[PDB]
Symmetry: C2
Subunit: 99 residues, 2 copies
């Protein structure tokens, strides 16, 4: 049994909720933007079925200096400066989802 896509999820929800699949997708889009707007304001969000959205800070990687092993030619890497990233954490009900 293969993976269940977002678009099949919408269909499965709509049939189980007995609601218009278009209204269903309106809901998740509203959630999607609320999650987005909060994170941008460094606000954390918990969504069903128990996932926590975090804003984490990523350390800067300095610019680096190397050589091609075969040809001895130099290669370089840009410095990737420190930035903000998004982490999700499975909460209590997601761990217990198999119980």
């Amino acid at each position: 049994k293969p993976t269940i896509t977002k678009q099949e999820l919408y269909s499965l929800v709509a049939a189980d909720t007995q609601l218009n699949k278009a209204l269903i997708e309106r809901i998740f889009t509203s959630q999607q933007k609320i999650i987005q707007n909060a994170l941008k304001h460094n606000q954390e969000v918990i969504i069903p079925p128990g996932i926590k959205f975090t804003v984490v800070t990523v350390k800067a990687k300095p610019a680096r200096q190397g050589h091609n092993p075969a040809t001895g030619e130099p290669i370089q890497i840009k410095a990737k400066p420190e930035h903000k990233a998004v982490k999700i954490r499975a909460l209590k009900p997601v761990h217990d989802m198999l119980n």
Copy 2:
């Protein structure tokens, strides 16, 4: 800015969509029971806004003794048995949410 509770999210979605909160809650309840039922059939599922749900077999890990790096306080870590676990991975839309 404080964390938005799983319950506070419902209120915000209910206002943005102009749906009643109880209608919002029935949708996510249905989404939970579909995730839960598919994972218990070892089936993968993708949910908005871009999180993938996987069932993995986690190996047994023996108990170990850690240390608070700044004080040297010992901290024991209990042994985990061989268990099945729910793993969630963030996809591109979530990792791009701050962009």
